[PDB]
Amino acid sequence: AGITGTWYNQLGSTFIVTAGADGALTGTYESAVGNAESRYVLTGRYDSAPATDGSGTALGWTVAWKNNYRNAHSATTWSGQYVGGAEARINTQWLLTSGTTEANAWKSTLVGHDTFTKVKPS
């Protein structure tokens, strides 16, 4: 139980993370789609003392899409909530910004939504 673990989203991407006691998120991300191969570094933050009223735990993290294999000149941030219990979720919305010229900045940022569970796809 908790944020720390291996998570998978609806695309089949793999999010491996450790939640530090005082709010750090640290791990790796492997995307099933896009200009990406293998694992990328991620860092983020989470609320390390959530409310005690049934609310989720706010969090977010970033991946810059550069590793030893590829550089897509882009970065994604995920913002969302962890929802605990017997079917633990992380429900997110994300912003993927590509480096562009200023004139093309209007088309620099994709938006979407990812839902993560600890269930490995089969």
Next chain:
Amino acid sequence: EAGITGTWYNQLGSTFIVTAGADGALTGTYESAVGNAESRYVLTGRYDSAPATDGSGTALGWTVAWKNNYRNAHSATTWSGQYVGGAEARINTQWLLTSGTTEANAWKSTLVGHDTFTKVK
């Protein structure tokens, strides 16, 4: 990365102090002028440490969870954007602010907006 590293302010009057590491790390503190926030908060993020040199911006993002040793808003913001270098350096962003909610209220958990940061120099 001397470009990104420094002190920045946005249109709301918020203060972003950041260091860009050789490995692509962003670390620093954020102080918001608005919202359920006081003092400085930890931020962490990532940037493209080997960006295109064809006139394109440098992609980056960072997160603040709105808990510090004074206050906890039970929320987190992520900024996604690009650094545009030169003498009038800017970081242009869009952001998502998610509050912890009950499941019934999750539909109203996330605000969206845009911040432009100017480097103090």
Next chain:
Amino acid sequence: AGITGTWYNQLGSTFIVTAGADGALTGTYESAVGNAESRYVLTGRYDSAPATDGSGTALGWTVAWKNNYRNAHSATTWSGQYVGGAEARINTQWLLTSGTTEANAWKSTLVGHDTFTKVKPS
């Protein structure tokens, strides 16, 4: 088969729409949540000649949350795709802007995602 019909999202809201031959969307929306009661007018647009390569049909619509019962001083736009076939979907992301003072404009706009099907909840 088609966009015209009665749709329901994951919240249990009801979206009743007619797709005009040349791109109009016209109908009503009833939200299961929020500062809303009964039906509200909606209008929007869709691509009335979609690609023939398996792509979805782009569309969007707006509701201003004023009717004879309530006025929330807000408006939502949904932007997304219709995906036809034997389990027809409308997959959307939305922006809900409330009227605010300029100083509070930073907190004026909620974002989320709704998926619609023609299956009435039970």
Next chain:
Amino acid sequence: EAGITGTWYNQLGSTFIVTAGADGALTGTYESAVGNAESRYVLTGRYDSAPATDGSGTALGWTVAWKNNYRNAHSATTWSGQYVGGAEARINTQWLLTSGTTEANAWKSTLVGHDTFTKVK
């Protein structure tokens, strides 16, 4: 609604011509300075026809499907925002641009951004 009704231009140089009806309707045409677009496109939307009078903006939104009698981009944009009246009238928006995609490519279907419109007067 004389306030909203008129001709507006955004920071890209796009042209928004709109009429606000007594019933809350928005109707008009949009011409984009950028993207897979030429000439005018139909728009339709809605606004709050009885807004607060406490200093708040007037909520509104509209849609353009990027098909006209010259071109079809297989895409649609919605703008969600508020009208701020007075002598320096503005419509401040965020937008979502969804392109039709295959199901496999749906993750990359939607762009987000922000436009500010100034009324020509």
